[PDB]
């Protein structure tokens, strides 16, 4: 009998532990639910919610059973549950003496179902008495799935209703969020035959039946539906619909329709449209609103079947696109095709504005038509030179893709493709040359090049790539060279010495340093620590100088004890993803990241005109001009990651750095998160906390905006739209969820006290810029009526402050 000689291993291990002791088995009676729902309706989180959300609350509830003389909760001890008294008296004990004395029908420990925290006072049993109570814990998660269950609900209602079919997944969720719940016990008239109503209703549960001239004509489940056609247009109801048992209705309101979404048509008629011209290789460089505009002027036609829509008696059509039915093209008398439902015809003539059209097209069957005339291409794209326009157009499509054009003013950028020469390459002609200084940034219009360096090849690049970029900022050495791998390659390209005579200094220093910083590979031996320029419990923030290129950076470290004392595991590489993805002028570009024994490592620009906290507060109260600049400047940050769904989630000023030029850059994306669905976790901080977040009902990206509201309210009026006095947490949420806005006597400005109380609108449906529209809502408000965006983006703008010399407070 042998023996095992290789090692087995052993196994390991507040005010949740207490309430276990006192928990307790009861049947919940009538008395104890009206007691629990009207103490609930008067609950901070729960006085939004509707009776039905309520009740699945009260079952959650537990019972606990006190003996007289029993401690319930400490002052000190942390913060997890909520009750209601059902029985006996409680005293509370503030600094061990007693304050208050509680009976049957009071609630306590209302903070606990927001967050964790730290109890003010202890509560005794004085009497034998029992509690009605819940945790954390079960309260958000009930939350959560009650609402979240309810969202993918309507969705799904919302994909079975047909007039929704050609909404995008970001049109059918944002109004699949306008969805209002309404009940109808038996008796009930849900709709009425001959009413002007405007709202689609969706049986989610029960049965109704549906009368036509006071008959019954049928009876409806589960999943059937009316009224679309209220929904686009006004017209009365065929139908009186009456609940037969007690039923449970999703409705959309056109009201409310029009509000999130726009004109139900008009939107419809945009996606078909921007998806049929997209299928041509020249609408495909349109931008969203060109597309859009074609689709809001298009002339749309019914025509019968063996018609000659067009006939080489044509009334400038430059484009068709069949809608519904069938047409059959034709070249003189050979037919060359048959378009069905969603194709198209005439990349030739839009391409080609004088050319006389030599085609014909006759109709199959009766048919739906959309045409595009060549004033409808000209007031789309704004100039009666179509051919130009769309050349134009195709070339301004490529360089707005580069981080080098992106963000120059429009004028700048015009200016820049007029410029454009074109030259032609034999093959084997090396276009560039490595080791060569080059002054050209090159666009491929035709053909093909191949990429080497030191002989080998590298890449193949085609009809619309680019290369040479780095002449335009840079006096350096080719790196690679660049071989005509075709015969007749054509390339469009621009001059160095045009390049500087359209970009001006700030532009130029910003585009300078940043593709350099980025190019320069780093190695954590090559940096020397000058100075601490931040502190924290996460970790530290050095100021570094690399020996090799002299180029400054900031060297950020996050101890590993840190990080995994709260269990942020998972966390510190989602931060690490989005930190090293983003690429906006006015957030903090990261250089690369590094590992070590002690902290996680991020190197980034440094950035050098201190925090945006500190200026306003040089400032003062900020003048129009200037709340416009700055506010402006974190309308672009968010917007852009708004585009790549990430919420940013902790906005405020402290948060948004100043540099050398005195533009914003945003740093610290530790609450940020890639939005994918509802968020429900509670983060951020307290102030700037949007009221969506604390109701526990899910959040979106809408709370960024909600902050960018708290922002602008600092700038203009000084101190806090909520809570500016108070400390505790609670009192915080209370004034950001029922307390008034108001604003100081001194504020004078009407628009900008419009778009502080549309941003600091509660409800996000109501909250200006959480439309389908996005930001183009906040843009054009009136308070920025005379601010020029596009100037912005580009460093044309004085800054409201410049500092004077530097300011400071896988991996
Ligand atoms: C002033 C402080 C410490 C908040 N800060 N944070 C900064 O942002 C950093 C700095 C290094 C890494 C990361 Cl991920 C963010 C920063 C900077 N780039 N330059 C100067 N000061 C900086």
Known sequence: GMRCNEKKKAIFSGEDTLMEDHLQLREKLSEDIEMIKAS?????????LNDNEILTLSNYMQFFVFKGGDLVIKQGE????????????????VNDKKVKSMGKGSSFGEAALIHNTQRSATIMAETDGTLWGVQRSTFRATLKQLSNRNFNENRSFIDSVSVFDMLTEAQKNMITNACVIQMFKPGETIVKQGDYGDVLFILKEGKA??????KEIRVLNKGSYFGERALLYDEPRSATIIAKEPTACASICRKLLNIVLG???????????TEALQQSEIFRQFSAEQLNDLADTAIVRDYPANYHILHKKVKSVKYLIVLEGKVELFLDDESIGILTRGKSFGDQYVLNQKQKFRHTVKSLDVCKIALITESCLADCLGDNNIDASIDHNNKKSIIKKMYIFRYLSEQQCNLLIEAFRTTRYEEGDYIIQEGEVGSRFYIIKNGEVEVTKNGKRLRTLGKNDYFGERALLYDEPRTASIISKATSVECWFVDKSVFLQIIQGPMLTHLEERIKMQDTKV??????????????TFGTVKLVHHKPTQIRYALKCVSKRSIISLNQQNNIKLEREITA??????????????????????????????????AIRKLGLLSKPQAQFY????????????????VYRDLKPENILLDKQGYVKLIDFGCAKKIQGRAYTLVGTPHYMAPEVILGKGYGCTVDIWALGVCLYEFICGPLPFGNDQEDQLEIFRDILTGQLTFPDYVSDQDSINLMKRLLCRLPQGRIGCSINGFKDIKEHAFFGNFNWDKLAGRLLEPPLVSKGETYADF
Do not use: W
């Open 263 to 273: 004109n139900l048509q008009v939107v419809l008629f945009r996606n078909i449209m």
């Open 40 to 48: 609930l309706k008067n609950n901070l989180v729960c006085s939004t």
């Open 631 to 646: 506010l402006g400047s974190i309308i672009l940050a968010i917007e852009y990651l708004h585009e790549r769904n990430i």
């Open 78 to 93: 942390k913060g997890s549950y909520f009750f209601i008294i059902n029985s006996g008296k409680f005293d509370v004990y």
């Open 581 to 614: 993805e983003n690429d906006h002028p006015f957030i903090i570009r990261l250089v690369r990241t590094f590992k070590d024994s002690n902290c996680f490592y991020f190197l980034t620009e440094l950035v050098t005109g201190g925090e945006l906290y500190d």
């Open 523 to 536: 190695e954590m031996h090559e940096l020397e620590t000058e100075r601490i320029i931040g502190r924290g």
């Open 209 to 214: 039946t549906v009368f036509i001239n006071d």
